[PDB]
Structure formats: C-alpha cells, structure tokens
Design an enzyme around this catalytic site. Structure first.
Site, PDB file in Angstrom:
ATOM      1  CB  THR C   1      -0.930   0.069   1.229  1.00 56.73           C
ATOM      2  OG1 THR C   1      -1.860  -1.022   1.197  1.00 56.73           O
ATOM      3  CG2 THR C   1      -1.701   1.397   1.238  1.00 56.73           C
ATOM      4  CE  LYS C  33      -4.691  -0.315  -0.890  1.00 54.21           C
ATOM      5  NZ  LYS C  33      -3.259  -0.639  -1.091  1.00 54.21           N
ATOM      6  N   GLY C  45      -6.818   8.825   4.061  1.00 54.21           N
ATOM      7  CA  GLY C  45      -6.253   7.671   3.367  1.00 54.21           C
ATOM      8  C   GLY C  45      -5.602   6.771   4.407  1.00 54.21           C
ATOM      9  CB  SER C 125       4.979  -1.262   1.931  1.00 51.61           C
ATOM     10  OG  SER C 125       4.149  -1.314   0.778  1.00 51.61           O
ATOM     11  N   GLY C 157       4.514   2.638  -7.280  1.00 52.60           N
ATOM     12  CA  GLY C 157       3.954   1.361  -7.703  1.00 52.60           C
ATOM     13  C   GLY C 157       4.869   0.478  -8.522  1.00 52.60           C
TER      14      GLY C 157
HETATM   15 MG   LIG Z   1       3.833  -2.991  -7.791  1.00 53.64          MG
END
Ligand SMILES: [Mg+2]
Ligand SMILES: [Mg+2]
Ligand SMILES: [Mg+2]
Ligand SMILES: [Mg+2]
Ligand SMILES: [Mg+2]
Ligand SMILES: [Mg+2]
Ligand SMILES: [Mg+2]
Ligand SMILES: [Mg+2]
Lengths: 173, 103, 173, 173, 173, 173, 173, 173, 173
Positions: C1, C33, C45, C125, C157
C-alpha cells in the site's frame, strides 16, 4: 534521539535534536523534544517511543500541577505509581527534567535518578556521546552551560544515525 | 504495674471486690503485680501487641481458679504473691514457630 | 500500500493504490484506500492491516463528529485515548488526513505528526518511494498538486510489490 | 551489583557497591544500595531491577511497620503474598535484611532463606565473588565483620564489570 | 576496550585502556594494547586478542616493505587480504595505525578509514565515547595531543563497563 | 571445573578439582587436571577434554624447544597457532602454566594473560570463585601457597555445581 | 533436588537431599525438603521452584485440614482446583505425600498418581536415579525401607549436580 | 540406548538393549550393540549408528597394535584422533571397552574415563539409570557380575523410552 | 498414548495402552485411559495432557448428566462452550466416546467429529498406527471388534515409544 542537560553558573540548560525516525528512515527532522512545563518554569526533554514519551511527559505534568510544582516530590510520586500491585503499564521512554533547584531523569519503568556532581544528564540513543563531550567540556573549559549543550549535541549528532542537527535548546534564566 | 492498681476501679480493685462478694478476701503483693505486668508486656512484645488490654487477658488467666472456687472458700483470705502468679501464669505463652515456611 | 498527499496552490490532494495482498499473493487490485469524511469535507487515506485501518478510520470519524469537524483537535483527542492508563489496544495501521487547513498523519499507536514545509505526507510500504518523487517534483516543477500525486503514486507502484496502479485520488477544491 | 553481609562478634554488617549500569554502560557510580529501616534498627541491601528492587524494599518496610518490626515474621508475611491464588506480580530483585537477631535474603518471587553457619549472605551479579572472599576471610582470619565486608566487596568489584568500588557499608552496633 | 588516537602539532599519540574481559568478568586490567612497530616508526593499537593482533602486526610489517613505508599503501593492502585470505577472516579485531604523516583504522570487514580534518580516530566498545570527548577537547582547548588522549580514556572508561583506567599511551616521536 | 594457581615464596602451586560432567550429571569425580610437563619442569592445568589438552600439552613441549624453556615465548607462540591453525581452533579449553619464574593462561581465543602483583591465576567455571578466595587469603594471611590453593578449591567447589572435592595439587619444586 | 519414598514391612519413608541451587551455583546445602503435616501424621517432600513448591505444599495442607486428614480425598480435591474453568495458575513443582495407608505424588498442574506395586515414588531432577537404585534394592534385598531410601538418595546425589548429600529422612512408625 | 559394564571377580561383563529408534518411533528391537574385538580378547559396546561404530571399532584394532594390547594406551589414542581427525568428529557415539585388566569409555568429545573402585561403566540415554541400579546392586548384594548387568538393563529399559528388553550380554572369558 | 475404537457386528469396543511418560522417561505403565460413564453405558478413552485429559473427560460427563445421556447432543453442547466470546480455555487433550448408537472424537479445542464408514476412531501419538492395522483388519478379516482392537493396539505399541503393552479394553455388550 539525543537529550543532554548542563547546570553551571546558576544556569540550567536542556536541549535535544529533532530527528524522528521510523525504522531506518527519517520522517521528520524538526521535532521539538524539549519543552517548558508548569507556567514555563521547569524544563523537560524526552526520548523513546514517540507515544510513550508524550504520555510519560503528560503524566508528569499532571503531577507538578497536584503539588506546588516541586520537581523532586513530583518525580517521586509519579515513580510511586509503578511501585505498587496495580502493574501500571510501563512506558518505553525517558525524561530529563530540571529547574532552578534540581535536575532529574525519570523512566517509564518507575525510577528517579539524580546527576553525580557536574550536574549533567543525557538520555536517548545518542546520549552517552553528548555526555562525554559535555563532561570533557565541563572539566576543561569555561564555556557557558548553554554553549556546552549545543556543542555536545552537535557532536553526538555526528555519531548517532538517529540524531540530527536540528536542535531545540531551552534554558532557565 | 501502675495501671493495675492506681486508677480508680483498677483490675486489682475489681477482683478484690468481686471475690469479697463470695466472702473471700484477696490481696495482691507488690511482687505479684510486678510479675503480672511483666508477663503482659512480655507477650505483647513477642506476639501481637494489644496494649493495656493484655492486662485483662493475663488477669483472667490468673484468676481462673479462684473465680471458680470462690463459693467454696468463704471466710478465707487468699494471698496472691509472686509464687501464686508464677504457677498460675504457666510458662512462655506458646512456641514461636514460623520456620515452617522458611527454606 | 502507498498513500501520499500534496498541498500547493490552495489545493489539497490525497491518493493511493488499490492492491490488497494476502501474503505474497494479491487478492484485489481495485480497493479504495482514500475516502471522504465529515460531509465530504476532509480527506482520509489509510494503510496497514485491512481491519486495523478501518477501525482507525472509523474511530477518527466519530471524533470529527463530536467536534465541529476540526482536524487538529480531533486528531489530538483520538491520540489522547492511547496516552492513559487504560491501554487502549493499539492498531497496526496509519492514517493521512487533510482539509482546507491542515494535513496530518495519525498512527494506531497514538501520535499525531504534521508535515515539514512542502506539505507532503506519505505512508505505507511504498510511502517513501512516492515521497521522494513528490519532494523532487515539488522543488523542481510547477505541476499541480493533483498531477504530483498521480505521478508519484505510479512511480512508487513500479518499485513496491504491494503497490499497484489502480489509484483513487481525492482532492479538496 | 554486589551485596554481602557478615555477622561475627555480636556485630552485623551489610554493604554494597555503587555502580548503576544501563546495558553495558555505567550511568551512576555513587548509588546507595544499602539502607536502614524501622527507626534505623534493621539493615537492608538490594539488587536487581532498579525499580523492582525499590518496590521489594518498600513492600518489606510496610511489613516491619505492621508488626513490632520482627525481621523473621515480616519476611514470612511478605513471602506469603506470593503463595496464594492472586498471582501477586513477581519482582526481579532480591533483598538482604538483618538486625541484632537474624539475617535473611528475600526474593521478588516469594521465598525467604537463612544463612548456613558462618552467617554470610550475598546477592547480585558479583555476589558469589564477595561470598568466597568472605567465607575464606571468616574461616582463616580474626578480621572484624566490618573489615571482611569491605575487603570482599572490593575483591568482587575487581572481577564483575557491574560492580564498582564506591561502597556503602552499614553495621548495627 | 578503548583505543583512541589524536594528532596535533606534528605530534601523533595513541593510547588505550588495559582491561581484558571474559563475558561479564574481568580477566586482566594491566594490558598493553598499543605497540611500537616498524623499528619504532609506526605505533599501532589493537582491539581484540593479542595473538590475533600479533598475527596481523607482523603481517603489516611485511606489507609495509612491499611499499616504501607508506602507511596507507600498506594498510589498504592488509585489509584487501584480511577479507580475501580465509585464514585472516578468522581473526576478528580493530586496528589503528599512525606514524608521521597520517592515521588509519583497518577492519576485517569494510576497509581503511582516514581521519577528518580533526585527525582523531577511536576503536573498541568505548571508542565512540573517547571520540566524543576528544573531538570536543581538540575543538575548544589548547591541551596537548597527549593531555587530550589522557582525558578521553578516563571519560570513556567511566562509561564503558568493558574499559578501565590502566592506560598505555604511546607518543611519537 | 576449577583450576587455580598461586605463587608465594619461590613456591608455585597448581591444583584442580576432579569432576567430569556430561550435561547436568556426573561422569567422573576422580580426575587429574594438572600434569607435570617438560621433564617435570613445567606444571600445567587444563579445563576441557583431556584429549584436547594432551594434544595441546605435547604441542607446548615442541614450542618450548624452539625457544629456551621460556614459558612466555612458548606460550605466546602456542596461542598464535591455536587461533590460526584450523585444527587447533577445534579444541576448546583453558590452559594454565607455571615453572619457576612466571605463571600464564593460554586461550584458544584472545591470548596469554599474566598474573598481577599477586601471582594468582584461575580458570574453569569455578575459577573466579577460587580466584576470589585466593586473592583474599594471600592479602590477609601467611598461609602457604599450598595451604591457600587447598582452601580455594574447597570454597569454589562448594559454590560451583560443576566442581567437586577430589583435588590434584601439583607443587614445585 | 531428589526425593524418594519406599513402603515395605509396614513402614513408610520419604527422604530428600538438601542442595538449593540458583542457576549453576549452590546457595544452601542444608535445606529440609521433607516435612511432617497434619499433627505430624503425614509425610510430604517437594521439588521444583522454591516458591512454587512451598505454595503447593501449603495449599495441600489446608486441604488435609478441611477433611479428616485423608490423603487420597485431599489429593483429589486439591487437583480438582485445576480441572475447572477458573484456570487456577499452575505451579512448577511436585509433591510426594504418604502415611500409614497410601503414597501419592501430586503436581502443580493438577493430577494425582499412585505407585505401581513396589510402592516407590521419586521426583526431582535426580528422581529417576534414586528410583532405579531403589527398585533394584527392593527386588533383590531385605534392607529396611529406611535403609533403601538413604542408600538410593546417596547414589542419586553422586550423579545429579543439583543433588547433594545432606539428607532429611522422615519415616512414619 | 543403554550399554552397561560391570567387573566383579576377574569377570568383566558388558550388556546392552536392542532398540533402534527414528525420532519417537521404533525401527528395530533386536539389535547387537556389544561386539567381540581383537580376536575375542576385547569386548566393546557402542551407542550410536552401527556403521559409525564399526568405523571406530576397526580403528581401535589398529591403535591396539601400535601398542601392546594396552586397552588404555589404545583408547587414549583413539580419542586423541577422534577429536583431531576431521572425518572422525563426524561420527557421534559413545564407546565402552573392557578386556581383562580395565574398563573404559571413549567420547568423541572429552576423552577416556576410567571406573571408580566399583568397576562399573554405563552409556546411552538410559545409562545413568542402569548405572544407579548397578552401583546399588554391587554394594549391597553378592549377585554375579552377569546377574547384575542383567537386572540393571531391565530397570533402565523400564524408565527410558528409548531402551527395550532384548539384551545382548557379552561375558568374558 | 494410543486409543482406538472399532464397531462391528453390533459390538462397540474402545481400548488403549497404559504408559504414562514424563518427557523421555516412563513414570507408570499401568494407567487406565479408557473408562465407563453414565451408569457405565458409554465408553470414553482419552489422550494428551494428563490433567487436560481428565478435565475434558469430567466436563463431558457433566454434560451426559444434564441430558438423557445422549452422546451426540452432549458432544455438541460441550463443543458449543468453545464457540462463543468467552474464550473457554482450551485443553490439550482428546476424547473418543461411544455407545450402542454412535462413536465420536471430541477435542479440547471445541469440535466433534464422526467416523467415516468402517466405524474406526483413534487418537494419541500412536493413533494412526493402530488405525492402519485396524482398517486393514476390518477390510480383510472376520475378526471380532474386540480382537481387532487388542491386535492393533499391540501393533501401535511396537512402533510408538510412548505406547506400551498394558491395555485396558472396554466393550459395550
Ligand atoms: Mg507494484
Ligand atoms: Mg546523525
Ligand atoms: Mg568492576
Ligand atoms: Mg569502566
Ligand atoms: Mg560442587
Ligand atoms: Mg551432586
Ligand atoms: Mg523402554
Ligand atoms: Mg512402545
């Protein structure tokens, strides 16, 4: 975190760094770990768990209020809440408190301790680093208590990874 | 020793009057009073300390016999002296055990 | 997340990924989220344990309601419930909350922390990954707060295995 | 920490070091680990957790007060509070208590133990080091109980890293 | 153990405590941890087993020949083998070397480390304490490079429970 | 195990218990842990497997030849190999050697250790207890170097559960 | 600790060692681990935690008192306090109890067990050592129950490091 | 496993159970753990993998040649190599040897162990139980060295869950 | 421990071993792990912690009593006490219960399970060993349910070290 206090020439100082770290990463570098209590007449600096520290601090402040703000008596009563059957949960933090009369360090486990002679206290991961620089500075210099604190904190900061250079120094005229 | 006799209606004066009722004449010697007080102060010190109440406990343990046979001793006079007290007040309360819990 | 928030040009944004993972396997990739609270006038969030996060969120919402919806005061009162004897169970989660006035991050252990200057917060994370991309974007670009958030989340991401590309970005006009 | 007690020639002594250490670092070297209780007619020395020790000490003092200050009886009643259903939390500390009659060591787990013959007790990390020096000194010398204590403490201190040379010796005339 | 080195005014000093511990007990307090090498031209200090050291001191002699008494060349070389040679990675220790132009520290892991513009180095559990004292003393006092090392050892030794007061100061020339 | 050595008046004595344990059970109580070496010129004591010892006792003979019966030269050498020779670091034990001019202790780790101005050495789980007894006896009594070792073993053996009373005292000459 | 009991020829014996050890060091060697209960008409011996043992013992004594001192019934009622919802804290100790009728071993976890045929019980670290010597002695000798107990305890003591030779043997005429 | 040896009246006996377990399950109950060696002149018993043993039994033959059938010389030698030879420290086991003048036990760790004035030795998880039985039987009975070993195995096997009843008794001559 | 039950030809049997072991040592070999409940009309066998087993057994018996002794209903109500908020402490044991109608196994964690077809249940460390021997015996023999139980228990006993040969077999005519 690093917090150190020096008392010399009728002057009491207590200062500390500003680095707040989560694991091996910094989160904030401008935290105020030293603050004034009881009508701004008592200095307090904390170290350890961010939440545990504040609760140790807060708990102590309530004490000063229930007494005439007497540092010693307050410290002793707060510590007494750990010396009973009701296992008052322990806090993973430490406090350095001082004023025109005394300087003490209080822990979240329930004990109060006084200096030694040179009136120097220090807590936190970087504590003993500032401690040495200060003992040294006090037994071989004429530097003000305010100067010793800033100089030792800086030193400590250059050694401990959890201690930065954004200080907050409070002194009691 | 002074609480035993000096105060108005002291224990010694009470028992004297109680027995006089049964036609018995009793008298405590100075030595007797002194042993009653030592015994009292003694057990308050080695066991539970109840203060001057202990005197009541000891006197009762002492006047045990006469209090029962007073009706059968009319006309007589009893002298409570040192010996009478050392007999009546047996020997050392009861043990001092406590090592039963120690390792 | 990953959750990040940027505040610039009188605009406040808070966005996050959508990947929900159980161990090393993904379960859902379209989770929201980031949501609106108090008559949709405050952004929130969350990150951490799915259940702990929702309970931290919910607990905070009750607060806003018991006050005039003042972010700061609310954050402080919620955190106070951890600074007492009654060891209010700790939650393994974190929240980022903001509105037209301030931006804060609150933890399930009981402490509130404010930004630093560039008004940037990030948790989870993948947090520090979006954090860097954002600090960078803010100190060297003219991009909107809404643009910075989307761009940093994407970056984060592509680095964290627990952060996907299904974003949910909320901004407060 | 090191605490030892010797009883010979109608004299009872109980002394200890002064080093207070946090981890592998010293904090204070002038602590008084031996003190007088019950109108200063009973000697007590403690070892272990700084807070646990004081609470074990304090708990014992309340006992002496509820009795005519009888060492044995007091020790037994205090220990009884651990021998019940109400699992009175255990303390990680130990006490050495003595007076004109007996000498005992009491632990925060709930048991009382008496010497052996040479009337020698010793607790703490450095305990057995002072213990040997003392047994030796007692079975081969004419030295006073006060001399044996100081000499053994010193020895112990030169062996244990948590035992210094700043002693505090109390004796009962 | 604590070994500290200070260079001030063409003067290079290296001193160290003398405590040898086995776990938490003292084995020896009068130990030499600083030896004179390369025909009294290169003073060195170790923090480990003397044998381990001797094995590395003799080997630094060899490397100091392959190259013209160049402390650094010889040093960088040693560490290149200490980590590669399977027999050398067996010996764990810290090394400090000084001669006339520079000071260094050799590790069985990372590798050589040179002083900052302060010319001070320290190793051993108490190293950082001595370092802190020195760095303060050299930046606020006019004390000799020898009077500084002197004090720094005292300060460190008082905080570290694995360091004592028997110092082995080796000056130069 | 407990091996202690005391030198007093040109007299060097070395004695030890005789208990061999396997975990928490006794395997043998009558064991010789002190042997006469180098043509009855060098008495030694071990604290480990006899085989391990024998392998090192024979090897100390060799090293004592390379050098003129110099206990120290031979010792410092052994430890230099015990740590370097891969086969020797297999053998774990403690060694004590004495002859006519000095006493020493050889470790498979650190290295040689010489006595203080007291001339006393001790090894084995009970070592420090015997050491404490001796140091006291030699500083307050006139007892023979043999009557001291005698007593020290008794004292240690009574505190250590891995040491007994069957002593193997080896005097010299 | 070692405790064993033998019943033969209308005679019941229960004896045990006297060694009290803290870790791998002895503290006292003259402890009485076997005592008489209920007007001295029932034998009881304990093993395990010093405090847990006494509390198991004490708890049992209260039982005998609430009944006509019937060993079996008492044992069963005490054990019943562990077989309920109220998880009566468990004690890390064991008891051997006997009288003119039966012999049982009770544990701090809540169960009662009877002998087998030769009426022999044994508990503690050294238990099974005395147990064998006793089974052997009973199936091949005419020795009294009092003789078997002393002989087996001694044996056990020569094997277990936590079992000494200072016995306390009680028998019920 | 349980291997016990008893020498009484020029008669030396060695017997052992026959259970081979894999964790907590029986793999084989009829196993020979005592073999005749050196032309039926030296009976030996093992407590480990038969292969491991065979590898060491053949090697004891070799060492028994270098020296004149001297059990001890050959033994002390084996253990000197078992610990030094890297291939031998691979084999973990216990060894018991007897012939006509003495009995011994060889360990892959410590080293040889001789019996006391009782002439009894035992190894294996159940060893100490068999030892306890024997020591009692040999000190209170006239039973044969063979009738003793017989019983001791039964006793041990009944207490140890890793020992059974199929015995392999090897007498001599 | 091993417990197995077979139901065939209108006959129900439940039997088990008798070995009670403390660690790797046996304590008793004649325990009755199978008993009759409710006016001796229901068979019950237990395995696991000696104390936990008895409390699981006892708890179940109270159930049968509060109902018309209906096995199923009782099992379900007992298990229901674990399926609520009040975390009824869990027991580390298991029960096999049967009668003229059904056979079930109940665990101290709160669940009931029924056979499969061949009406065979088995619990304990040795369970699956008796289980196989029984499945085999049932799908290839005409042996009585009473014969199958005894034969399988024996087998199991020859494999598991915690299962002996002292059986207790109960059958319901
Ligand atoms: Mg990823
Ligand atoms: Mg830093
Ligand atoms: Mg020390
Ligand atoms: Mg120190
Ligand atoms: Mg011993
Ligand atoms: Mg023993
Ligand atoms: Mg068996
Ligand atoms: Mg079996």
């Amino acid at each position: 975190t690093t917090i150190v206090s020096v008392r010399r020439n009728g002057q009491v100082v207590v200062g500390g760094d500003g680095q707040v770290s989560l694991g091996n990463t910094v989160m904030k570098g401008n935290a105020r770990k030293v603050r004034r209590l009881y009508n701004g007449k008592v200095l307090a600096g904390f170290a350890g768990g961010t939440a545990d520290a504040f609760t140790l601090f807060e708990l102590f402040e309530r004490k000063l209020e229930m007494h005439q703000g007497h540092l010693l008596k307050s410290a002793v009563e707060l510590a007494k809440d750990w010396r009973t059957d009701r296992a008052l949960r322990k806090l993973e933090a430490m406090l350095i408190v001082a004023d025109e009369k005394e300087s003490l360090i209080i822990t979240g486990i329930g004990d109060v301790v006084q200096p030694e002679e040179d009136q120097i206290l220090a807590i936190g991961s970087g504590g003993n680093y500032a401690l040495s620089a200060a003992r040294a500075l006090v037994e071989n210099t004429e530097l003000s208590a305010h100067e010793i604190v800033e100089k030792s904190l800086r030193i400590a900061g250059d050694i401990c990874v959890f201690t930065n250079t954004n200080f907050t120094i409070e002194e009691l005229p | 020793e002074r609480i035993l006799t000096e105060p108005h209606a002291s224990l010694t004066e009470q028992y004297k009057a109680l027995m006089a009722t049964e036609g018995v004449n009793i008298a405590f010697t100075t030595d007797a009073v002194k042993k009653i007080a030592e015994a009292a102060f003694r057990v308050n010190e080695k066991t539970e300390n109840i203060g001057a109440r202990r005197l009541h406990t000891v006197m009762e343990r002492l006047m045990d016999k006469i209090s029962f046979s007073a009706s059968d001793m009319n006309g007589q006079t009893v002298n409570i002296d040192a010996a009478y007290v050392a007999d009546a007040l047996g020997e050392v309360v009861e043990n001092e055990d406590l090592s039963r819990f120690i390792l």
